[model samples]
Target: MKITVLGCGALGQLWLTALCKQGHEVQGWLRVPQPYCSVNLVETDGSIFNESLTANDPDFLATSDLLLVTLKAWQVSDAVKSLASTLPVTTPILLIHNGMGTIEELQNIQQPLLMGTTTHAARRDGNVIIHVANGITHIGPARQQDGDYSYLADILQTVLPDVAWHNNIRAELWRKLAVNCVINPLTAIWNCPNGELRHHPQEIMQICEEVAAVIEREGHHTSAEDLRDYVMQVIDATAENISSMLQDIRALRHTEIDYINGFLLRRARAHGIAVPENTRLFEMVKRKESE
Candidate 1:
């Protein structure tokens, strides 16, 4: 399939390499306009696969069957707006971002929208991306999709170890958000690894309570205990991994605190549910981002 990756960040580069290795025609839209496409992939076994993608040519983007958007939470809308006139309305757009605000704001483009989240981790070092760990990627339609887009999962699993197409994607999104609410902000504020979160069980439990409250209010039945359990499980599993939030702050880049905890903060407010823990971390991370 002819596909265009809208962002050339770590995740974007990861997908580009996988698609190119599979012999799929891949095009890229770099964050800064670059004359040449270059991103090296370092596999887990230290094997380096240098993947070079094609140009950002709008004509290629327009003709592509799919557009994979791996941009940051805040950048997706503006990037889509810039590509609006160039893309066909029928082309499928798969968005794999950490946060949730862009989905509601993306009403302008009448396309089959697939919202996704991934646990797979990779970090970029001087144009080279090291695939650090393996994790699942969950994807589904943001709305009622008549098209058979599950083929996307099969294609994605070629590189990503596990990929699932969920029918009830909203619940999956919320579940992922809940996990992020507990892990992201605290890690950023405390400047610690995931395993350190396990030391503050009670504090983490209370935060999970607030996050689960918003999730339940959204119509998914899950208890704070259940949420905290899974959050702890994830923390233990990725103990050595530094979260994206922590990574962003350390790199002097903007974190998605607004869309993750901030999104939960807004939802809790709309439902009249107070999220003090989430709110506190939200403000803390927000200040850190401006540094």
Candidate 2:
């Protein structure tokens, strides 16, 4: 199997390394020509694996079976458009970034699109990658009633090991968004670990309530209490973990406020649902982004 990944960040490097070790050909389609696509990957253990991957293959997308995009939500649309000209309609493109909005924006592209989200964690510095943890991925057709994407999920499992194809991916995305809505901006603004949210159950409750309303209006049956419980559970599970948004802020890189909280605000407006907590967090994150 052949895979072409755009933006060789930590997430992209994770897939590239695993795919290469699986004896599959992998190439990275980078924004600019780099010194090399080869990398030094530090595994969860202290052991390190060095893998050489092809880079800047002009027709990589046209010839590949899968085009996996690992860029952040803000960069997805531009990345897809840059590589889209050579893409054969037969190629399936899977987006595994956080939050939403990018999916609908990429609808103009001609290829078969699969929507997804993942818990696999990685951090990239230059060409070096740290595989922090393993996690499951949920993938499904962007359009309802589209063909089965299990085969695509199968290809991912070869490298990812725990990928599942879902019949209702929107629900999965919503659950993630609902969880992220409470965790990301709050943690990013406060510079706290996930468990610190436990101290502010009242704030979490209000945010979850607003987020749940938007979710229900968007066609999913979920209660504010249910969302609140789920968010608290996630905080408990990943108690010490700092969110990706906070890491981005600490690194001085752009965060995914637009796609996460901003996306919620947009939908809330569409349905005329009041999301005061979400709106406040959205503004606060934007303010922090500019600071």
Candidate 3:
């Protein structure tokens, strides 16, 4: 498969290296033009691999079989606008980003839209990618479509090894949002690893309940207990890991609080649901981000 990835951050490098190792033709894009770019990936087992990159040429879109966007949640809109005219109407575009709000932007394009979320974790140490953990990906159509995602799932699985096609992609996206709603904010605010969430059980449960209520109000019907359990599993799996939000806070960079917790607040307002817990979390992160 010939793939064009729009962002060349840690997640993008991870995806590009693995796909290239699986013998797929992968091309990477950057906002600024560069003479050369390559990914140096270090697997969890300490194996190293290299993958080359190419400029995100508008013309490349014409020959690409699929477009994989791994941009940050905040960067998706402008990137989509820049590539909108160049992208062919028939090519499948997969968005793999954190949080929400990009789905509405994607509806503007005339293409087969697919949304995906990955549990895989990696951090960029200088120019090298340190693979920290492995997780599955769930991908499916975001809009109404009868298109088959089996081939895409097969290709991704061959490289990443734990990819699945979902019949209900929206639910899966919200499920991830629910997890992020709890884990990301709390970790950032406490300045601790995910496992520390166990120390503040009430906050976790309340956040989960509020998010699940908003999800249910949106017609998904997720119970607070089920959502809490799902979040616990993620926390257990990544016990020692510092969340991306916390990493951003330490680096003094902006976090994705708006799209994660703030997104919940927006939905709550629409449904007339009171989510003080989520609102408080959002304010705390925003205040920190401004500091």
Residue-wise C-alpha lDDT for candidate 1, range 66-99, written one tens digit per residue: 8899999988888987886777888888899888
Clashing pairs in 3: none
Query: Between prediction 1 and prediction 2, which has the larger TM-score?
Result: 2
Model 1 vs. true fold: TM: 0.92
Positional deviation of residue 57's Cα in model 1 after best superposition, in angstroms: 0.6
Model 3: how far is 12 from its true place, Å?
A: 1.0
Pairs with backbone N, CA or C atoms under 3 Å apart (clashes), candidate 1? none
Candidates ranked, most accurate by TM-score first:
2, 1, 3
Worst 10 residues of 3 by lDDT: 142-151
Predicted candidate 2 versus true structure: per-residue lDDT over 149-206, tens digit per residue? 6688877787777999987888999988888888999999999999999999998999
Per-residue CA lDDT of candidate 3, range 38-136, in tens? 888899899998756775665676778888999888888778778767777777888888788777766777877788888898888888888889998
What candidate 1 gets wrong by more than 4 Å, as runs, is 145-148, 158-161
What lDDT does model 3 reach? 0.83
* Full-model lDDT for every candidate: 0.85, 0.85, 0.83
Residue 37 lDDT, candidate 3, scale 0-100: 57
